Write a protein that binds this DNA or RNA. Structure first.
Ligand SMILES: [Mg+2]
Ligand SMILES: [Mg+2]
Ligand SMILES: [Mg+2]
Ligand SMILES: [Mg+2]
Ligand SMILES: [Mg+2]
Ligand SMILES: [Mg+2]
Ligand SMILES: [Mg+2]
Ligand SMILES: [Mg+2]
Lengths: 207, 84, 150, 129, 190, 83
RNA sequence: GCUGCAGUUAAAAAGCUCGUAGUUGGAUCUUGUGGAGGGUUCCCCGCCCCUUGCCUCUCGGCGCCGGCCCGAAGCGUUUACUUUGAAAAAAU
């Protein structure tokens, strides 16, 4: 937003640079060109943070406008985003899908997995292409976290970030939960949040 | 292809990336420069893409060499781009 | 789109929009004209005069300093050659090719390129005769053409 | 070569409308292009336009609405004489309620609806609908 | 001198001769003579401005023009502090001729050279109106009611000399020709 | 669409896309009606009124609805400037 | 197949290039308002230079208080184009 209550604070830029979310890929595509600051001395692109923040608050403003919280289905297929989507759906009452997608869940009126969402959030356009291709049949908008080499086909609100590393992905889902819960009422601003981002990170099997 | 690009007010740097003619209004990439021989002393004015051999007067009896592009000065010190 | 070649490139020059003289200038209109006459006396074609003036002196385009183009300047004093150098250089090249052709007759690529050069010569003489620059009884014949160059 | 300047000005406008572009650049500019654009803009098929002036023929930048459906040229400039006009606007135009034929008459470059209002034939240039 | 220095200008003129005699006066003094040699003029006029000011035009005979331009700074400041509260602009007085085909019936006179065309003189006027600024770009926006709007783009050097005068350029032009002009200093020098 | 008497003789008036001004047909199962929320300008909380945007299937298929919504929002104070 | 067809694989682009006729050919050379017909700028009379328009006189009918003046003579370099008049048997 244009305001000052919605502006990025110094405590969040440290969370960003600590998770590494500013660090892009090696290849750029001509649709993500407005989100890049400059290519490093070695071949890697820096993502502009102020632009990440504005696209993240636009996604939150798109999610808050849906009345029933339970038709904002969230999807992750890679192993890094499963815990994050499960915790995001818990914190704000969406319906998560981790693992395989079982094509036809959006367009098949027999299956027991058939639902009719009203939004669609997704971790990675290039790894969860089946939900996008199916959303392209039932008038279904889409929000997506994009790496610097993400194809922006059928996505409607791309959020630029490092999409590869587990810490980055969990931090982005945590911040998306923070800002929907903030502007819906609920956990009012001028307080830190009870949950720490590490509840949202990938497990990466332990000792 | 952002589908809403602005053609009338281009970038101050992306309009110097283009060809000399494909830009909005044509402009040459060449320039004129003051050159100093360190020997005799004048102010010879030389074209950047010379393609000729230049002498000062007598003295060094060379001041530039022609190439396939910008001419190179032998040891002509202090060369200044002239302006508009 | 090359006339007699299958290539196509844009290597032309591009003179600027500010058509005024450059605020600095070591010369003035009639000093340029004398500098032109001097080089014209030594046997330089207008193109050579313009390059020499561009490379060692401040004059980027004579026409912006003196009003007239170089050939009109050379004419208003009676110094232009009898035939323009566009045709002169082509006749010189055709004579050069025909000498080699007379030396070794097993060269067929030289035959082809000579045909193309002469096509250019004819297409240019046909236009120079329309503007009354050449007499209407002018004719490119190989022998008298070798005579013309000298 | 570029035998016809208006033809490629109109085809480059029309190739960009099919693509959703907000603006086009067309070059070279010409007297007849500016008049045809003014006729097409008076009705509301295009927005404002700007002329970029080099010291040569120049370039135009046009602001495209999404209202234009097709504009085009008639390749030889045929003579049209106020009785052929009905048989012309029954081939080129998509209906009788919209779409215009542009022709040059001795009173300027105008449309057919004004040509009959001023009792003048002329030469056909093109159409837009 | 001061009574014949408006030839083909109907020399007895209150305001024109008023500018004249004072101009020729501070010319005739021995202050600075190496700058001028009592050059002719032909006309002058004071014109109003939308901003509520006064601007006087100096119609120079065109073969003089280059020699006026060689100064153009001492003369303007002197005549300005003499007529303080106004603005001073110089124009070289050129001739428009009717279209040879049809704006006036032909009688087989001559070819009507290009310099005497309407557009050529209308451009040379704008060249002379803003001399120290050396026009570097032009643009024309045709708006949604049929009227046009010209934009001139001048250097970012010689700025502080013209933008205080830049308001009166619009008035001078809209009074001479009839077009709406704007003046800009572009995005950046490129 | 009216007639000379004045009434409106039409089944319905189809909506038009907000990025390309082309109407959205009746069998375009790729067009959306994205709806974004408005905040209360002081505490940054949702309050009723919201904005709505339609995007056609074609320009959504060429990967351009992303940088089109960004422009429809920035033009309209949801983002003000300086994206 | 002018409106209006075809020539990668169904029938079909000369092996390739030059070239006279033929067909085609880049940009550029005057604009607001007073009254007036259609709106509240814009599209017959005339003003920033011209706006049928310069003239050279002459005889014929026209002003006015021997004198004063505009219409009448050339015509706007020409064409194509376009609008309008004239002149084109009936029968069908
Ligand atoms: Mg080419
Ligand atoms: Mg070359
Ligand atoms: Mg060349
Ligand atoms: Mg067939
Ligand atoms: Mg076969
Ligand atoms: Mg076959
Ligand atoms: Mg072949
Ligand atoms: Mg032409």
């Amino acid at each position: 937003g244009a305001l000052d209550v919605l502006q990025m604070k110094e405590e969040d830029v440290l969370k960003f640079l600590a998770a590494g979310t500013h660090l892009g890929g090696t290849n750029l595509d001509f649709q993500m060109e407005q989100y890049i600051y400059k290519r490093k001395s070695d071949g890697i692109y820096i993502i502009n943070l102020k632009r990440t923040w504005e696209k993240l608050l636009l996604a939150a403003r798109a999610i808050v406008a849906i009345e029933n919280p339970a038709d904002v289905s969230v999807i992750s297929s890679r192993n890094t985003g499963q815990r994050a989507v499960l915790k995001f759906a818990a914190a704000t009452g969406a319906t998560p899908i981790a693992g395989r997608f079982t094509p036809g869940t959006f367009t098949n009126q027999i299956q027991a997995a058939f639902r009719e969402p009203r939004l669609l959030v997704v971790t990675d356009p290039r790894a969860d292409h089946q939900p996008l291709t199916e959303a392209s049949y039932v008038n279904l908008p889409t929000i997506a976290l994009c790496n610097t080499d993400s194809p922006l086909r059928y996505v409607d609100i791309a959020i630029p970030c490092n999409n590869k590393g587990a810490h980055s992905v969990g931090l982005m889902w945590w911040m998306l939960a923070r800002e929907v819960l903030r502007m819906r009422g609920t956990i009012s601003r001028e307080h830190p949040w009870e949950v720490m981002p590490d509840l949202y990170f990938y497990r990466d099997p332990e000792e | 292809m952002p589908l809403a690009k602005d053609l009338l007010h281009p970038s101050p740097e992306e309009e110097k990336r283009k060809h000399k003619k494909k830009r909005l209004v044509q402009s040459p990439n060449s320039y004129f420069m003051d050159v100093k021989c360190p020997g005799c002393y004048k102010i010879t004015t030389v074209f950047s893409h010379a393609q000729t051999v230049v002498l000062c007067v007598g003295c060094s009896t060379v001041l530039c060499q022609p190439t396939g592009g910008k001419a190179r000065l032998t040891e002509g010190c202090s060369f200044r781009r002239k302006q508009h | 789109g090359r006339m007699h070649a299958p290539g196509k490139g844009l290597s032309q020059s591009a003179l600027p929009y500010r058509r005024s003289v450059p605020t600095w200038l070591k010369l003035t209109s009639d000093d340029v004209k004398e500098q032109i006459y001097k080089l014209a006396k030594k046997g330089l074609t207008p193109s050579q005069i313009g390059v020499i003036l561009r490379d060692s002196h401040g004059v980027a385009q004579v026409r912006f300093v003196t009003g007239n183009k170089i050939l009109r300047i050379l004419k208003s004093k009676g110094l232009a050659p009898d035939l323009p150098e566009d045709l002169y250089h082509l006749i010189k090249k055709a004579v050069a090719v025909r000498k080699h052709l007379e030396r070794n007759r097993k060269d067929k690529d030289a035959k082809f390129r000579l045909i193309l050069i002469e096509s250019r010569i004819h297409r240019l003489a046909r236009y120079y005769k329309t503007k009354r620059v050449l007499p209407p009884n002018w004719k490119y014949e190989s022998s008298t053409a070798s005579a013309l160059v000298a | 070569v570029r035998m016809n300047v208006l033809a490629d000005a109109l085809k480059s406008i029309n190739n960009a409308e099919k693509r959703g572009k907000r603006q086009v650049l067309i070059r070279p500019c010409s007297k007849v292009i500016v008049r045809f654009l003014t006729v097409m803009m008076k009705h509301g098929y295009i927005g404002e336009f700007e002329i970029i002036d080099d010291h040569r023929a120049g370039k135009i930048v046009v602001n495209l609405t999404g209202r234009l459906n097709k504009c085009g040229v008639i390749s030889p400039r045929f003579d049209v004489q106020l009785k052929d006009l009905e048989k012309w606007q029954n081939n080129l135009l998509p209906s009788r309620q919209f779409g215009f034929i542009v022709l040059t008459t001795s009173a300027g470059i105008m449309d057919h609806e004004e040509a009959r209002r001023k009792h003048t034939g002329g030469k056909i240039l093109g159409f837009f609908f | 001198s001061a009574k014949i220095v408006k030839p083909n200008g109907e020399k007895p003129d209150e305001f024109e001769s008023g500018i004249s005699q004072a101009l020729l006066e501070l010319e005739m003094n021995s202050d600075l003579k190496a700058q001028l040699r009592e050059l002719n003029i032909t006309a002058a006029k004071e014109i109003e401005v939308g901003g509520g000011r006064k601007a006087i035009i100096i119609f120079v005979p065109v073969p003089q023009l280059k020699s006026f331009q060689k100064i153009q700074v001492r003369l303007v400041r002197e005549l300005e502090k003499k007529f303080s509260g106004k603005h001073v602009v110089f124009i070289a007085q050129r001739r428009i001729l009717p279209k040879p085909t049809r704006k006036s019936r032909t009688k087989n006179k001559q070819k009507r050279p290009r310099s005497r065309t309407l557009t050529a003189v209308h451009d040379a006027i704008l060249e002379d109106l803003v001399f120290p600024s050396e026009i570097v770009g032009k643009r024309i926006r045709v708006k949604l009611d049929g009227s046009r709007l010209i934009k001139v783009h001048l250097d970012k050097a010689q700025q502080n000399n013209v933008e205080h005068k830049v308001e009166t350029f619009s008035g001078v032009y809209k009074k001479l020709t009839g077009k709406d002009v704007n003046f800009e200093f572009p995005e950046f020098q490129l | 669409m009216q007639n000379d008497a004045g009434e409106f003789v039409d089944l319905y008036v189809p909506r038009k896309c907000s990025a390309s001004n082309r109407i959205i047909g009746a069998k375009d199962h790729a067009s959306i009606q994205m709806n974004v929320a408005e905040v209360d300008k002081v505490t940054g909380r949702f309050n009723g009124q919201f904005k709505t945007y339609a995007i056609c299937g074609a320009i959504r298929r060429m990967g351009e609805s992303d940088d089109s919504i960004l422009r429809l929002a920035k033009a309209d104070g949801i983002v003000s400037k300086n994206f």
